[model samples]
Target: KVFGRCELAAAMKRHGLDNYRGYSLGNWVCAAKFESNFNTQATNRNTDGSTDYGILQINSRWWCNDGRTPGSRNLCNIPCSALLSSDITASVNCAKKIVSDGNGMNAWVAWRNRCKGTDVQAWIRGCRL
Candidate 1:
């Protein structure tokens, strides 16, 4: 799908996710940018037998299931392929659940490795939300 950073930020705000569990809109946007380039269809297999799914690149080890993976927590109770759509409500809700479980954006390696200590205010720079 083709979603702009600003649009994503606006939607996150509408979903009250700008500051969910201490995660800023900038963090979410930055993580999504680095993880999937805002492409919902993005999926990557990890070296550890897990796969990352969707804009947030959520892991199959603890989130959605791809069916091929033998042991998935499936905490989001959704098929991993569902996250590949432009309709991001389930994806966003799953992310919130991850944060509420106390991971915050730190659950994402992309956020930990790239967004944690950077000046990422520009991620939502021109959004009118």
Candidate 2:
């Protein structure tokens, strides 16, 4: 729940959102809260057995491994705990990109609809910048 602005700013740059500081910061905070209770150091296993790692709880295996861009080889193949511990800044930044673009709350809402669940958009619509 304790977020350092400087750390997050650095993370924004690391994730390739250098010029979109205001936008990226908001998006990162929103994404983190939606997925991980804003706990920058939380870990969990998805139903499909993938690990949601770091503050953004990034599923690096899917987002970076089998995803559009393969991230660091070592970072993608580990538990959330290890990933965060190994590289906190990189881990957070990687998670931010994955969720914000690759697999974020909007994607989650879409998937929810497809699965015959209520539209999760209602919960996150106002959170958008």
Candidate 3:
């Protein structure tokens, strides 16, 4: 499923992403925008042989069990397949784990490149959150 900016924030908040780890809904929306363009099936295979899944781009390297990444952390104790679904609850739950880790919201490098240290509030502008 492809979510509009407003819908994405709505979904994330419904899944407890509001003020998660001190990051605002706008921050989450911004990172999701740059990471996966709000597409649920968006996947990225990195040079490290790890793949990122879902709108938030949860990775096989540490979050999900892809069955391909060697010695994966699978911290979310979920299959990467679950991350790519229209049901974003699993994705948001996994993101909770990701943000709670040492890296905070920086786990998705795109957050740094675009969302972080920028006007991320703009990402949720006009959205009636």
Candidate 4:
């Protein structure tokens, strides 16, 4: 019943999971698809002069400032090129961590729905119960 590609299917099989509902990683691929067409090489120059890097569209400066310095058009948090070798599932898992505590796929999905195209402040308002 999932909407996106079967990206997590292989991941689940490799990790020995019976289903995706019990895990927060299920929505990462889809969210990535919605965000950047699941292009692991994708990077977006956001309207606010920021960047969304790789599969998760990670904001290099805001989320992980180690790879890319603050206030740069280039997003390199963890060297975005490293995405070529990253564990896709793990990356998504980490995205889940960045939001909604930990293990918040529902929260992630909700966040995506609220923020992907809408105003962030409005999205935050909607997320607050």
Candidate 5:
């Protein structure tokens, strides 16, 4: 499912990503723009052979299990397919674990390059967060 800006804004907030781990709602909103463009089914297979799934691009290396990531760990204890759902809750739930592990927002290259030091609020401009 492709979410409109405010829909994604509200969903991310509702899923517990708003200001999560010191990263503001704006940061989360903006990262989705670059990571998955607010599309729930987006997927990227990493060079390391692990894959990133869903809106926030949760990786399979350690956060989820795809059953094909050689030496994988299901830290989120969920199948990678779960992250592809339109609901986004599973992806955000796993994302919480990813950030909590130590990397924080730096876990995403898109976040580092596009959202780290920019005016992320622009991503949610006019939205009632």
Candidate 6:
């Protein structure tokens, strides 16, 4: 599995996400921390009958297809399981798209609830990237 914090930042930097699509690595990392605790295999079933998948907790209602789950728009054209991999490539791209399509990081409930207007500098603290 991938390491959390610095490793995630380094990988994201490698994938051109250090400051991608007008969003900062801190924003991504902080949101990821609250969403999945940096675990790639994380999943949460929403009260709305939808599920959030992976580190970014992508929504099945709009992003990926679970095949068994109904009403999945799958706009990313990927299986929901793809986001659950240690490889953050697909999820990162999907996140960029989501941020681009919406009100930046405000699209993520975790970001709005946990990261926004807070001292997110700590999210990147000690990370060499």
Model 6 vs truth, CA RMSD? 1.3
Per-prediction TM-score: 0.93, 0.47, 0.96, 0.51, 0.95, 0.92
Q: Which ten-residue region of model 4 has the weakest summed lDDT?
A: 120-129
Give the per-residue lDDT digits (tens) of candidate 5, residues 66-88.
88999988899999999888888
lDDT of 4 by residue, 1-129 (tens): 122345443453354432344433334434555665656666666566555666666665555443445564332244544543345654444454455455444434434584444443321132212
Better of 4 and 5 by lDDT: 5
Candidate 1 whole-model C-alpha lDDT, 0 to 1: 0.86
> Which of the numbered candidates is closest to the native, going by highest lDDT?
3
**lDDT to native, each model:** 0.86, 0.48, 0.91, 0.47, 0.89, 0.85
Clashing pairs in model 3, backbone N/Cα/C closer than 3 A:
none
Cα lDDT tens digits for candidate 2, 21-97: 22334444445545555456676765665656556566645643433233434344444455455345556555445
Compute the lDDT of residue 50 as modeled in candidate 3: 96
Q: For candidate 2, what is the lDDT?
A: 0.48
- Model 3, 1-129: lDDT tens per residue? 999999899889888998998998889999999899999999989999999999999989988998999988888999999999998999999899889988898888999888788988888889888
- Tens-place lDDT digits, model 1, residues 1-129: 867989888877887888888777898889889999999999999988989988888889988988877777899999998888888887898999888887567788888999999988889987886
Local accuracy of candidate 6 as per-residue lDDT tens digits, 1-129: 545788887787787876777767787888888988898899999887788989889998899998756767888989999999989898998988898885888889989999998887788889886
Candidate 4's C-alpha runs over 4 A off are 1-4, 12-26, 66-77, 84-86, 100-111, 114-129
Runs in model 1 with CA error above 4 Å? none
Superior candidate under TM-score, 1 versus 6: 1
Which candidate order results from sorting by lDDT in descending order? 3, 5, 1, 6, 2, 4
TM-score quality measure for candidate 6: 0.92
Q: Runs in model 2 with CA error above 4 Å?
A: 1-23, 63-79, 96-129
